[PDB]
Amino acid sequence: IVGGYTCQENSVPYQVSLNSGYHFCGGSLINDQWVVSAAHCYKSRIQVRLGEHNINVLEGNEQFVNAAKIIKHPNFDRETYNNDIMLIKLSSPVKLNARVATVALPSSCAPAGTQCLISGWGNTLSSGVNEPDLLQCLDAPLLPQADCEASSSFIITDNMVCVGFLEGGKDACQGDSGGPVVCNGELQGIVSWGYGCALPDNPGVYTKVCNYVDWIQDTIAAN
Numbered sequence: 001i002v003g004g005y006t007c008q009e010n011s012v013p014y015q016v017s018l019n020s021g022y023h024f025c026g027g028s029l030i031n032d033q034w035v036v037s038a039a040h041c042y043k044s045r046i047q048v049r050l051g052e053h054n055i056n057v058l059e060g061n062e063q064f065v066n067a068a069k070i071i072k073h074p075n076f077d078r079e080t081y082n083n084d085i086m087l088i089k090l091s092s093p094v095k096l097n098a099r100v101a102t103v104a105l106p107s108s109c110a111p112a113g114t115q116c117l118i119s120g121w122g123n124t125l126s127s128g129v130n131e132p133d134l135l136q137c138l139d140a141p142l143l144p145q146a147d148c149e150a151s152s153s154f155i156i157t158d159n160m161v162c163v164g165f166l167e168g169g170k171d172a173c174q175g176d177s178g179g180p181v182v183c184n185g186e187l188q189g190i191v192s193w194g195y196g197c198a199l200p201d202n203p204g205v206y207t208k209v210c211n212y213v214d215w216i217q218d219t220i221a222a223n
């Protein structure tokens with residue numbers, strides 16, 4: 001997260017870190033045994049880390065669980081990033097508490113202008129790379145599809161939404177991928193891609209979660 005602030009400890013209880021010996025992506029806990037992330041974060045073996053604040057220091061609230069089933073959206077297009085959503089079933093249910101809790105699926109698509117919270121342990125620099133120890137937070141609004149499509153050098157599909165600032169300075173970045181965009185208590189987006197990080201006229205692009213609620217529930221029930 002570029003231009004954000006350090007989240008208060010365990011104030012984003014649904015946030016998880018996907019680890020394969022190192023943190024490589026984020027995710028959201030949607031129920032005691034299922035996590036939603038980005039398909040581009042796929043790996044054959046993933047350890048999900050919950051209750052984290054400092055990913056490099058054991059604090060006493062962590063629960064590390066291995067992924068049992070890693071399910072990418074059947075239509076994930078690796079070239080356009082369309083359908084960039086993935087579900088991870090944990091090998092065992094987690095203990096839900098104050099620092100480890102679930103986030104609700106959207107009831108409807110949030111309107112442009114809605115203020116949301118983006119979080120992650122991704123790169124904090126607009127140029128170069130710097131991985132933070134502590135979870136970062138960013139308050140950012142959903143942008144009108146017109147500004148989204150216009151700013152993007154690539155095709156923005158109906159399954160994508162821009163969140164951020166046209167002026168730059170604040171944005172998600174590498175390592176935040178798969179992470180949550182929560183607006184009014186509901187998961188509205190998933191960190192997907194962007195041209196650079198925190199660049200003017202280049203807001204980040206996220207998977208529009210409200211378009212997959214049915215697929216999410218169907219997959220969970222069938223697995």
Ligand SMILES: O=C(C1CCN(c2ccncc2)CC1)N1CCN(S(=O)(=O)c2ccc3cc(Cl)ccc3c2)CC1
Pocket residue numbers: 079080081154155171172173174175176177191192193194195196197203204205206
């Ligand atoms: O420009 C790119 C790719 C992004 C994916 N991609 C397309 C191509 C066509 N359509 C959609 C996406 C091709 C260009 N990258 C530069 C930025 N990196 S990154 O720094 O690791 C990164 C990763 C995720 C991000 C997510 C957000 Cl929401 C904002 C910036 C982000 C930046 C990823 C690759």
Ligand SMILES: [Ca+2]
Pocket residue numbers: 052053054055056057058059062
């Ligand atoms: Ca820790």
